[PDB]
PDB file of C-alpha atoms in Angstrom:
ATOM      1  CA  UNK A  10      19.710 -15.988 -10.402  1.00 43.99           C
ATOM      2  CA  UNK A  11      18.225 -12.486 -10.283  1.00 44.99           C
ATOM      3  CA  UNK A  12      20.116  -9.634 -11.954  1.00 43.28           C
ATOM      4  CA  UNK A  13      20.485  -6.959  -9.262  1.00 45.10           C
ATOM      5  CA  UNK A  14      21.903  -4.114 -11.306  1.00 45.25           C
ATOM      6  CA  UNK A  15      24.985  -2.395  -9.860  1.00 43.60           C
ATOM      7  CA  UNK A  16      23.902   1.218 -10.205  1.00 43.94           C
ATOM      8  CA  UNK A  17      25.954   4.401 -10.304  1.00 45.16           C
ATOM      9  CA  UNK A  18      24.086   6.874  -8.099  1.00 44.53           C
ATOM     10  CA  UNK A  19      25.214   9.925  -6.074  1.00 45.14           C
ATOM     11  CA  UNK A  20      26.297  12.116  -8.981  1.00 44.32           C
ATOM     12  CA  UNK A  39       6.049  21.636   8.641  1.00 43.01           C
ATOM     13  CA  UNK A  40       4.875  18.127   7.781  1.00 43.28           C
ATOM     14  CA  UNK A  41       1.568  16.820   9.133  1.00 41.53           C
ATOM     15  CA  UNK A  42       0.537  13.204   8.501  1.00 41.15           C
ATOM     16  CA  UNK A  43      -2.123  11.026  10.106  1.00 40.81           C
ATOM     17  CA  UNK A  44      -1.775   8.781  13.153  1.00 42.55           C
ATOM     18  CA  UNK A  45      -2.989   5.151  13.193  1.00 44.90           C
ATOM     19  CA  UNK A  46      -4.607   3.307  16.119  1.00 44.84           C
ATOM     20  CA  UNK A  47      -4.780  -0.260  17.443  1.00 45.68           C
ATOM     21  CA  UNK A  48      -7.831  -2.406  18.152  1.00 41.29           C
ATOM     22  CA  UNK A  49      -8.325  -3.817  21.655  1.00 43.49           C
ATOM     23  CA  UNK A  50      -9.268  -7.494  21.382  1.00 44.99           C
ATOM     24  CA  UNK A  51     -10.735  -7.270  24.892  1.00 43.54           C
ATOM     25  CA  UNK A  52     -12.948  -4.253  24.192  1.00 47.28           C
ATOM     26  CA  UNK A  53     -14.254  -5.930  21.041  1.00 45.93           C
ATOM     27  CA  UNK A  54     -14.614  -9.542  22.191  1.00 43.26           C
ATOM     28  CA  UNK A  55     -16.839  -8.332  25.047  1.00 43.72           C
ATOM     29  CA  UNK A  56     -18.757  -5.843  22.893  1.00 43.30           C
ATOM     30  CA  UNK A  57     -19.587  -8.691  20.514  1.00 45.57           C
ATOM     31  CA  UNK A  58     -20.447 -10.985  23.434  1.00 44.01           C
ATOM     32  CA  UNK A  59     -22.788  -8.210  24.603  1.00 45.45           C
ATOM     33  CA  UNK A  60     -24.623  -8.191  21.264  1.00 43.93           C
ATOM     34  CA  UNK A  61     -25.441 -11.906  21.074  1.00 45.29           C
ATOM     35  CA  UNK A  62     -26.612 -11.560  24.688  1.00 47.62           C
TER      36      UNK A  62
ATOM     37  CA  UNK B   7       2.652  -0.652 -10.233  1.00 49.94           C
ATOM     38  CA  UNK B   8       3.371  -2.293  -6.890  1.00 46.73           C
ATOM     39  CA  UNK B   9       2.774  -6.013  -7.214  1.00 46.01           C
ATOM     40  CA  UNK B  10       2.332  -7.493  -3.738  1.00 43.39           C
ATOM     41  CA  UNK B  11       3.101 -11.206  -4.209  1.00 41.63           C
ATOM     42  CA  UNK B  12       5.360 -11.793  -7.227  1.00 43.43           C
ATOM     43  CA  UNK B  13       8.922 -13.087  -7.663  1.00 43.34           C
ATOM     44  CA  UNK B  14      11.750 -11.656  -9.755  1.00 43.54           C
ATOM     45  CA  UNK B  15      11.180 -14.200 -12.519  1.00 41.65           C
ATOM     46  CA  UNK B  16       7.440 -13.555 -12.163  1.00 41.59           C
ATOM     47  CA  UNK B  17       8.023  -9.818 -12.570  1.00 36.42           C
ATOM     48  CA  UNK B  18      10.236 -10.591 -15.569  1.00 35.63           C
ATOM     49  CA  UNK B  19       7.472 -12.879 -16.845  1.00 36.53           C
ATOM     50  CA  UNK B  20       4.952 -10.044 -16.627  1.00 37.47           C
ATOM     51  CA  UNK B  21       7.234  -7.424 -18.174  1.00 34.76           C
ATOM     52  CA  UNK B  22       8.013  -9.776 -21.070  1.00 36.67           C
ATOM     53  CA  UNK B  23       4.404 -10.840 -21.742  1.00 36.05           C
ATOM     54  CA  UNK B  24       2.272  -7.806 -20.813  1.00 38.65           C
ATOM     55  CA  UNK B  25       4.869  -5.036 -20.712  1.00 37.35           C
ATOM     56  CA  UNK B  26       6.753  -3.097 -23.362  1.00 40.93           C
ATOM     57  CA  UNK B  27      10.188  -1.482 -23.413  1.00 43.55           C
ATOM     58  CA  UNK B  28       9.911   1.062 -20.593  1.00 41.04           C
ATOM     59  CA  UNK B  29       7.542  -0.917 -18.383  1.00 37.13           C
ATOM     60  CA  UNK B  30       8.286  -1.474 -14.710  1.00 41.25           C
ATOM     61  CA  UNK B  31       6.819  -2.514 -11.367  1.00 35.74           C
ATOM     62  CA  UNK B  32       7.678  -2.655  -7.665  1.00 33.76           C
ATOM     63  CA  UNK B  33       7.616  -5.758  -5.477  1.00 32.10           C
ATOM     64  CA  UNK B  34       8.938  -7.059  -2.152  1.00 29.27           C
ATOM     65  CA  UNK B  35      12.520  -8.308  -1.999  1.00 30.08           C
ATOM     66  CA  UNK B  36      12.964 -12.068  -1.655  1.00 26.64           C
ATOM     67  CA  UNK B  37      16.714 -12.028  -0.938  1.00 24.15           C
ATOM     68  CA  UNK B  38      16.446  -9.355   1.797  1.00 21.73           C
ATOM     69  CA  UNK B  39      13.033  -9.469   3.502  1.00 22.68           C
ATOM     70  CA  UNK B  40      11.933  -5.922   4.251  1.00 23.91           C
ATOM     71  CA  UNK B  41      13.472  -4.261   1.209  1.00 23.55           C
ATOM     72  CA  UNK B  42      11.732  -3.833  -2.143  1.00 22.23           C
ATOM     73  CA  UNK B  43      12.742  -4.489  -5.735  1.00 21.24           C
ATOM     74  CA  UNK B  44      12.148  -2.466  -8.902  1.00 24.60           C
ATOM     75  CA  UNK B  45      11.941  -4.665 -12.006  1.00 23.66           C
ATOM     76  CA  UNK B  46      12.282  -2.729 -15.278  1.00 24.81           C
ATOM     77  CA  UNK B  47      12.132  -3.733 -18.944  1.00 27.24           C
ATOM     78  CA  UNK B  48      14.601  -2.277 -21.449  1.00 25.46           C
ATOM     79  CA  UNK B  49      15.581  -3.532 -24.911  1.00 23.35           C
ATOM     80  CA  UNK B  50      13.387  -6.602 -24.538  1.00 23.96           C
ATOM     81  CA  UNK B  51      15.150  -7.684 -21.339  1.00 23.23           C
ATOM     82  CA  UNK B  52      14.566  -7.023 -17.648  1.00 26.38           C
ATOM     83  CA  UNK B  53      16.650  -5.274 -14.997  1.00 29.16           C
ATOM     84  CA  UNK B  54      16.032  -5.729 -11.271  1.00 31.11           C
ATOM     85  CA  UNK B  55      17.058  -3.000  -8.829  1.00 31.96           C
ATOM     86  CA  UNK B  56      17.504  -3.146  -5.053  1.00 33.99           C
ATOM     87  CA  UNK B  57      15.424  -0.654  -3.052  1.00 32.58           C
ATOM     88  CA  UNK B  58      16.784  -0.123   0.456  1.00 33.83           C
ATOM     89  CA  UNK B  59      14.311   0.029   3.359  1.00 35.46           C
ATOM     90  CA  UNK B  60      16.011   1.531   6.407  1.00 34.84           C
ATOM     91  CA  UNK B  61      12.733   2.134   8.229  1.00 37.03           C
ATOM     92  CA  UNK B  62      13.443   5.861   8.421  1.00 32.10           C
ATOM     93  CA  UNK B  63      13.724   6.357   4.641  1.00 34.21           C
ATOM     94  CA  UNK B  64      13.926   4.585   1.286  1.00 31.67           C
ATOM     95  CA  UNK B  65      16.607   4.778  -1.386  1.00 32.31           C
ATOM     96  CA  UNK B  66      18.365   2.716  -4.045  1.00 33.51           C
ATOM     97  CA  UNK B  67      21.422   2.079  -1.854  1.00 30.95           C
ATOM     98  CA  UNK B  68      22.599   5.589  -2.651  1.00 29.75           C
ATOM     99  CA  UNK B  69      21.287   8.703  -4.303  1.00 28.92           C
ATOM    100  CA  UNK B  70      18.248  10.604  -3.086  1.00 25.68           C
ATOM    101  CA  UNK B  71      16.343   9.620   0.056  1.00 24.65           C
ATOM    102  CA  UNK B  72      12.565   9.353   0.346  1.00 21.20           C
ATOM    103  CA  UNK B  73      10.049   8.897   3.139  1.00 19.30           C
ATOM    104  CA  UNK B  74       7.768   6.498   1.239  1.00 20.23           C
ATOM    105  CA  UNK B  75       8.216   3.831  -1.417  1.00 18.89           C
ATOM    106  CA  UNK B  76       5.758   5.623  -3.717  1.00 18.80           C
ATOM    107  CA  UNK B  77       7.514   8.978  -3.303  1.00 23.96           C
ATOM    108  CA  UNK B  78      10.659   7.180  -4.491  1.00 20.19           C
ATOM    109  CA  UNK B  79       9.128   5.479  -7.527  1.00 20.39           C
ATOM    110  CA  UNK B  80       7.367   8.685  -8.574  1.00 20.43           C
ATOM    111  CA  UNK B  81      10.590  10.704  -8.405  1.00 20.54           C
ATOM    112  CA  UNK B  82      12.379   8.376 -10.838  1.00 16.43           C
ATOM    113  CA  UNK B  83       9.369   8.358 -13.176  1.00 15.25           C
ATOM    114  CA  UNK B  84       9.578  12.158 -13.414  1.00 17.55           C
ATOM    115  CA  UNK B  85      13.407  12.189 -13.629  1.00 18.53           C
ATOM    116  CA  UNK B  86      14.443   9.658 -16.272  1.00 20.68           C
ATOM    117  CA  UNK B  87      18.173  10.433 -16.364  1.00 22.43           C
ATOM    118  CA  UNK B  88      19.055  10.047 -12.692  1.00 23.27           C
ATOM    119  CA  UNK B  89      18.888   6.230 -12.634  1.00 22.41           C
ATOM    120  CA  UNK B  90      22.175   5.217 -14.280  1.00 26.84           C
ATOM    121  CA  UNK B  91      24.407   2.189 -13.831  1.00 25.40           C
ATOM    122  CA  UNK B  92      28.196   2.227 -13.867  1.00 23.88           C
ATOM    123  CA  UNK B  93      28.041   1.246 -17.549  1.00 24.30           C
ATOM    124  CA  UNK B  94      26.293   4.561 -18.273  1.00 22.43           C
ATOM    125  CA  UNK B  95      23.159   3.077 -19.839  1.00 22.25           C
ATOM    126  CA  UNK B  96      20.029   4.716 -18.419  1.00 21.52           C
ATOM    127  CA  UNK B  97      17.129   2.821 -16.843  1.00 21.21           C
ATOM    128  CA  UNK B  98      13.877   4.696 -17.515  1.00 27.14           C
ATOM    129  CA  UNK B  99      10.821   3.978 -15.359  1.00 27.00           C
ATOM    130  CA  UNK B 100       8.063   4.803 -17.852  1.00 25.86           C
ATOM    131  CA  UNK B 101       5.035   2.468 -18.150  1.00 25.72           C
ATOM    132  CA  UNK B 102       3.662   1.213 -14.801  1.00 23.81           C
ATOM    133  CA  UNK B 103       2.374  -2.364 -14.995  1.00 25.16           C
ATOM    134  CA  UNK B 104      -0.695  -2.649 -12.770  1.00 23.62           C
ATOM    135  CA  UNK B 105      -1.753  -5.726 -10.796  1.00 24.24           C
ATOM    136  CA  UNK B 106      -5.260  -6.852  -9.880  1.00 24.93           C
ATOM    137  CA  UNK B 107      -7.067  -4.845  -7.233  1.00 26.35           C
ATOM    138  CA  UNK B 108      -7.823  -6.420  -3.838  1.00 25.23           C
ATOM    139  CA  UNK B 109     -11.581  -5.775  -3.887  1.00 25.03           C
ATOM    140  CA  UNK B 110     -13.842  -4.274  -6.524  1.00 27.77           C
ATOM    141  CA  UNK B 111     -16.206  -2.898  -3.862  1.00 26.75           C
ATOM    142  CA  UNK B 112     -16.519   0.859  -4.274  1.00 25.09           C
ATOM    143  CA  UNK B 113     -15.511   1.426  -0.642  1.00 26.07           C
ATOM    144  CA  UNK B 114     -11.955   0.618  -1.797  1.00 26.58           C
ATOM    145  CA  UNK B 115     -10.067   3.720  -2.964  1.00 26.68           C
ATOM    146  CA  UNK B 116      -6.728   2.091  -3.768  1.00 24.89           C
ATOM    147  CA  UNK B 117      -3.961   4.672  -3.601  1.00 23.77           C
ATOM    148  CA  UNK B 118      -5.155   7.365  -1.202  1.00 22.46           C
ATOM    149  CA  UNK B 119      -3.249   9.215   1.503  1.00 23.17           C
ATOM    150  CA  UNK B 120      -4.539   9.523   5.045  1.00 21.22           C
ATOM    151  CA  UNK B 121      -4.654  13.290   4.608  1.00 17.98           C
ATOM    152  CA  UNK B 122      -6.723  12.852   1.437  1.00 15.99           C
ATOM    153  CA  UNK B 123      -8.933  10.204   3.049  1.00 18.59           C
ATOM    154  CA  UNK B 124      -9.436  12.673   5.909  1.00 20.43           C
ATOM    155  CA  UNK B 125     -10.412  15.521   3.571  1.00 19.66           C
ATOM    156  CA  UNK B 126     -12.779  13.121   1.787  1.00 20.61           C
ATOM    157  CA  UNK B 127     -14.679  12.121   4.926  1.00 17.56           C
ATOM    158  CA  UNK B 128     -14.736  15.619   6.464  1.00 16.28           C
ATOM    159  CA  UNK B 129     -16.353  17.100   3.324  1.00 16.00           C
ATOM    160  CA  UNK B 130     -18.779  14.459   1.981  1.00 16.36           C
ATOM    161  CA  UNK B 131     -18.947  12.016   4.898  1.00 17.62           C
ATOM    162  CA  UNK B 132     -20.890  11.392   8.102  1.00 18.84           C
ATOM    163  CA  UNK B 133     -20.693   9.395  11.319  1.00 18.82           C
ATOM    164  CA  UNK B 134     -19.904   5.815  10.354  1.00 20.07           C
ATOM    165  CA  UNK B 135     -18.641   6.821   6.909  1.00 22.07           C
ATOM    166  CA  UNK B 136     -15.724   4.545   6.062  1.00 23.45           C
ATOM    167  CA  UNK B 137     -13.392   3.533   3.261  1.00 23.79           C
ATOM    168  CA  UNK B 138     -10.483   1.163   2.662  1.00 26.41           C
ATOM    169  CA  UNK B 139      -7.218   2.417   1.177  1.00 26.89           C
ATOM    170  CA  UNK B 140      -3.661   1.327   0.482  1.00 28.89           C
ATOM    171  CA  UNK B 141      -1.279   1.816   3.406  1.00 30.28           C
ATOM    172  CA  UNK B 142       1.477   4.156   2.238  1.00 30.99           C
ATOM    173  CA  UNK B 143       3.674   3.699   5.313  1.00 30.82           C
ATOM    174  CA  UNK B 144       3.479  -0.113   4.995  1.00 26.53           C
ATOM    175  CA  UNK B 145       3.347  -1.236   1.348  1.00 27.83           C
ATOM    176  CA  UNK B 146       1.172  -4.304   0.903  1.00 25.41           C
ATOM    177  CA  UNK B 147      -1.047  -3.523   3.894  1.00 24.61           C
ATOM    178  CA  UNK B 148      -4.273  -1.512   3.870  1.00 25.60           C
ATOM    179  CA  UNK B 149      -6.146   1.000   6.027  1.00 22.72           C
ATOM    180  CA  UNK B 150      -9.737   1.292   7.286  1.00 23.56           C
ATOM    181  CA  UNK B 151     -10.382   5.021   7.693  1.00 22.59           C
ATOM    182  CA  UNK B 152     -13.607   5.764   9.586  1.00 28.15           C
ATOM    183  CA  UNK B 153     -15.281   9.042  10.552  1.00 31.78           C
ATOM    184  CA  UNK B 154     -16.100   8.984  14.276  1.00 30.44           C
ATOM    185  CA  UNK B 165     -15.680  19.048  13.946  1.00 29.29           C
ATOM    186  CA  UNK B 166     -14.730  15.733  12.350  1.00 30.65           C
ATOM    187  CA  UNK B 167     -11.865  13.326  12.932  1.00 29.19           C
ATOM    188  CA  UNK B 168     -11.387   9.950  11.255  1.00 32.48           C
ATOM    189  CA  UNK B 169      -9.827   6.895  12.909  1.00 30.21           C
ATOM    190  CA  UNK B 170      -7.362   5.011  10.712  1.00 33.75           C
ATOM    191  CA  UNK B 171      -6.777   1.310  11.400  1.00 33.14           C
ATOM    192  CA  UNK B 172      -4.042  -0.791   9.814  1.00 35.92           C
ATOM    193  CA  UNK B 173      -4.958  -4.024   8.021  1.00 34.27           C
ATOM    194  CA  UNK B 174      -2.146  -6.590   7.926  1.00 36.14           C
ATOM    195  CA  UNK B 175      -1.788  -8.554   4.676  1.00 37.06           C
ATOM    196  CA  UNK B 176       0.303 -11.692   5.224  1.00 34.96           C
ATOM    197  CA  UNK B 177       0.155 -15.024   3.375  1.00 34.88           C
ATOM    198  CA  UNK B 178      -2.619 -13.563   1.186  1.00 35.07           C
ATOM    199  CA  UNK B 179      -4.748 -13.351   4.352  1.00 33.89           C
ATOM    200  CA  UNK B 180      -6.228 -10.367   6.176  1.00 31.10           C
ATOM    201  CA  UNK B 181      -6.520  -9.540   9.867  1.00 33.39           C
ATOM    202  CA  UNK B 182      -7.161  -6.356  11.836  1.00 33.47           C
ATOM    203  CA  UNK B 183      -5.091  -6.405  15.007  1.00 35.16           C
ATOM    204  CA  UNK B 184      -4.831 -10.178  14.655  1.00 34.87           C
ATOM    205  CA  UNK B 185      -8.473 -10.497  15.665  1.00 35.70           C
ATOM    206  CA  UNK B 186      -9.622 -13.068  13.116  1.00 31.87           C
ATOM    207  CA  UNK B 187      -8.591 -14.524   9.769  1.00 34.54           C
ATOM    208  CA  UNK B 188     -10.438 -13.635   6.576  1.00 33.59           C
ATOM    209  CA  UNK B 189      -9.851 -14.794   3.017  1.00 35.39           C
ATOM    210  CA  UNK B 190     -10.472 -11.383   1.386  1.00 37.54           C
ATOM    211  CA  UNK B 191     -10.821  -7.692   2.187  1.00 38.47           C
ATOM    212  CA  UNK B 192     -14.590  -8.014   1.743  1.00 38.12           C
ATOM    213  CA  UNK B 193     -15.035 -10.805   4.297  1.00 39.37           C
ATOM    214  CA  UNK B 194     -13.023  -8.687   6.748  1.00 42.62           C
ATOM    215  CA  UNK B 195     -15.120  -5.568   6.097  1.00 46.55           C
ATOM    216  CA  UNK B 196     -18.272  -7.688   6.357  1.00 46.41           C
ATOM    217  CA  UNK B 197     -17.330  -8.967   9.818  1.00 46.74           C
ATOM    218  CA  UNK B 198     -16.517  -5.620  11.430  1.00 46.60           C
ATOM    219  CA  UNK B 199     -19.693  -4.031  10.077  1.00 51.16           C
ATOM    220  CA  UNK B 200     -21.452  -6.685  12.190  1.00 52.64           C
ATOM    221  CA  UNK B 201     -18.865  -6.699  15.027  1.00 54.81           C
ATOM    222  CA  UNK B 202     -17.495  -3.144  15.297  1.00 54.52           C
ATOM    223  CA  UNK B 203     -13.962  -2.687  16.604  1.00 58.26           C
ATOM    224  CA  UNK B 204     -12.919  -0.472  19.529  1.00 54.30           C
ATOM    225  CA  UNK B 205      -9.818   1.736  19.687  1.00 54.31           C
ATOM    226  CA  UNK B 206      -7.490   2.149  22.676  1.00 52.91           C
ATOM    227  CA  UNK B 207      -9.084   5.375  23.914  1.00 54.60           C
ATOM    228  CA  UNK B 208     -12.326   3.389  23.766  1.00 54.46           C
ATOM    229  CA  UNK B 209     -14.195   4.714  20.734  1.00 54.43           C
ATOM    230  CA  UNK B 210     -16.322   2.079  19.002  1.00 51.62           C
ATOM    231  CA  UNK B 211     -15.724   2.051  15.236  1.00 53.12           C
ATOM    232  CA  UNK B 212     -19.169   1.407  13.749  1.00 53.69           C
ATOM    233  CA  UNK B 213     -19.082   1.074   9.950  1.00 55.88           C
ATOM    234  CA  UNK B 214     -22.488   2.516   9.131  1.00 52.98           C
ATOM    235  CA  UNK B 215     -22.278   3.433   5.427  1.00 46.94           C
ATOM    236  CA  UNK B 216     -19.408   3.416   2.909  1.00 45.80           C
ATOM    237  CA  UNK B 217     -18.022   6.506   1.215  1.00 46.25           C
ATOM    238  CA  UNK B 218     -17.930   4.940  -2.232  1.00 46.84           C
ATOM    239  CA  UNK B 219     -15.645   6.023  -5.055  1.00 48.02           C
ATOM    240  CA  UNK B 220     -16.698   8.605  -7.640  1.00 49.34           C
ATOM    241  CA  UNK B 221     -15.544   7.442 -11.102  1.00 46.09           C
ATOM    242  CA  UNK B 222     -15.571   3.632 -11.016  1.00 45.79           C
TER     243      UNK B 222
END
């Protein structure tokens, strides 16, 4: 198998925000182009 | 160093063929989907290590905690003596073994934070200036940052089964085919902004 080593351990911020695409907004926008 | 689609034996295969003593890489965990594995080479043999993914932080089932997988792997590259096993022998993450890039197009910037992709577009970018970068919060996935007094709109790209989709809209065989489609069929965010990909913000030193 794999050899998962048994280890001996234990011895202000500003990021960006993602968005989501609206299939409806886009499927109609595309359908508007071809038209 | 992060190899997206390789197995433990495959990692071992790479480390033994391409790598030297001190080489390493990171990969997804097969035995515990969600977690990640750190395969290292030492004394001509390989050592796999379990990376815990809680969702709120990453760690090696103990020790120091980190927000991102890369922040973890960097820390142990800079601190070679912290990663010890009960035996006492040290595991040193030294030479990163690099995989193929997704796309050679110069609109791909590989490792690049959203803050740094923001600075990039708000200094040498314009409306419709876009790039593609590695998603730090979701290793394996990618990001389409687009400039739309300047704010960019980041969009996650899901990489599953070696396929690409943006919001599960359509299937594409490569990052290029996906970026080719949405240049022709722009996407629209929730607020309602249309994301037109006008011109790419290419890389500097190819």
